[PDB]
Amino acid sequence: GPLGSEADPRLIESLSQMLSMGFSDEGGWLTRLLQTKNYDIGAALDTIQYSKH
């Protein structure tokens, strides 16, 4: 039962670009997104607009 939330070295690298671009991790949408996009900046940028529809 950890406090707050942790991250990884091969993950924060991506978030650094998102947060600077104008994003965040409210709720945990950018804490797992990158992990699913193989820590990508161009793929994560197109994961906020929508999902399928």
Measured CA to CA, the distance from residue 4 to residue 50 in angstroms comes to 27
| H-type alpha helices, 1-53 | 9-21, 33-36
Measured CA to CA, the distance from residue 48 to residue 45 in angstroms comes to 7
Measured CA to CA, the distance from residue 2 to residue 23 in angstroms comes to 24
Rg (CA), the chain: 11
Measured CA to CA, the distance from residue 40 to residue 53 in angstroms comes to 22
* Experimental method of this PDB entry: NMR
Measured CA to CA, the distance from residue 51 to residue 28 in angstroms comes to 16
**∠ at Cα 38 (35, 39), nearest 5°?**
75
Residues 6+ apart with CB under 8 A from 48: 23, 29
For domain 1-53, say whether CATH 1.10.3470.10 is its number: no
